[PDB]
Amino acid sequence: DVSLTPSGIKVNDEITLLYPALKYAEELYLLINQNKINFIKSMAWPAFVNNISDSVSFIEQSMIDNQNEKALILFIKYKTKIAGVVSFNIIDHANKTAYIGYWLGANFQGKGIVTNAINKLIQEYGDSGVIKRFVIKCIVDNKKSNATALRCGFTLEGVLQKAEILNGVSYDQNIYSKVI
Ligand SMILES: CC(C)(COP(=O)(O)OP(=O)(O)OC[C@H]1O[C@@H](n2cnc3c(N)ncnc32)[C@H](O)[C@@H]1OP(=O)(O)O)[C@@H](O)C(=O)NCCC(=O)NCCS
Ligand SMILES: Nc1ncnc2c1ncn2[C@@H]1O[C@H](COS(=O)(=O)NC(=O)[C@@H](N)CC(=O)O)[C@@H](O)[C@H]1O
């Protein structure tokens, strides 16, 4: 499979999902910084990304988790730029289940980048039998994420009541799945 390269997974001519590396720390940090205000609306962690060193620490931990298959953290490269992150936040090996996460900088939204990335990951891990069940869980009012999940052929399984905390408040999540 020539799409599985040493540096990452080639989705198409424009998108590669890069294995994390320290060299990406600067670009990743700047991207988060540019999007911090909007990102804080939908994710907890951006509120605390204050220096490049925080992105270095994230990369270091992501590489450890990737090595041990605890997670699969990938940096989305669109053309020449890092666009965001797509991940299996959690890989449950016993139950062959992967929980998906993602984000894109504002300048990279509306381009199908995450949809294309997810479809590729599901082909690679799902059609090979490594993962049986893929899950997207996100706060109910996250309109763009809901659209992405449905666009990728996921099915709504239910609402997880008061399951995600942002800034001390618990919010309901939709849980979507795609089963091979
Ligand atoms: C969730 C998020 C990644 C969605 O980004 P996105 O760009 O809408 O994601 P997709 O890859 O599904 O792209 C779909 C959009 O690209 C457009 N489109 C353009 N080219 C396309 C292509 N090649 N394939 C599919 N759609 C394409 C679609 O029409 C759609 O645009 P629309 O929203 O104007 O209808 C983004 O809103 C984000 O990063 N949000 C903050 C982080 C977050 O909330 N993460 C999830 C935590 S719960
Ligand atoms: N410090 C950091 N720097 C850069 N990216 C980071 C990061 N911390 C996390 N991410 C990435 O942010 C994305 C979204 O992860 S998330 O934990 O904020 N939320 C969810 O997954 C929802 N679906 C809710 C749920 O799954 O319950 C993932 O791709 C992570 O790898």
Question: Domain of 166: which CATH number?
Answer: 3.40.630.30
104 annotated among ligand-binding-site residues: yes
8 annotated among ligand-binding-site residues: no
Any atom of ligand 2 within 6 Å of the Cβ of 101: yes
Amino acid identity, position 113: I
d(CA 4, CA 11): 9
Phi, psi of 22 (to 5 degrees): -60, -30
Q: How was this structure determined?
A: X-ray
* Residues after which a C–N gap over 2.5 Å breaks the chain: none
Place of tokens 């669109």: 78
For the chain, the domain total comes to 1
Positive or negative CA dihedral for 73, 32, 76, 102? positive
CA distances from 91 to 5, 68, 98, 108, 129 (A): 21, 10, 5, 27, 14
> What DSSP string describes 68-109?
TTS-EEEEEEETTEEEEEEEEEEEETTTTEEEEEEEE-GGGT
Mark 15-54 as b/e (b = at least 16 C-beta within 10 Å). Answer: bbbbbbeeebbeebbebbbebeeebbebbeebeebeebeb
Any atom of ligand 2 within 6 Å of the Cβ of 148: no
d(CA 62, CA 65): 5
The pair of structure tokens assigned to 53 is: 């060193």
* Deposited resolution, Å: 1.2
Q: Dihedral (C-alpha) 180, 77, 13, 126: value to the nearest 10 degrees?
A: -10
Tell me the best of 45, 78, 109 to mutate to test the pocket of ligand 1, counting ligand atoms within 8 Å of each CB and taking the most: 109
**Gyration radius from the chain CA atoms:** 16
The pair of structure tokens assigned to 112 is: 């199908």
Residues in contact with 129: Cβ distance below 8 Å, sequence separation at least 6, in sequence order? 180
d(CA 65, CA 99): 14
Q: By residue range, what is the domain housing residue 45?
A: 1-180
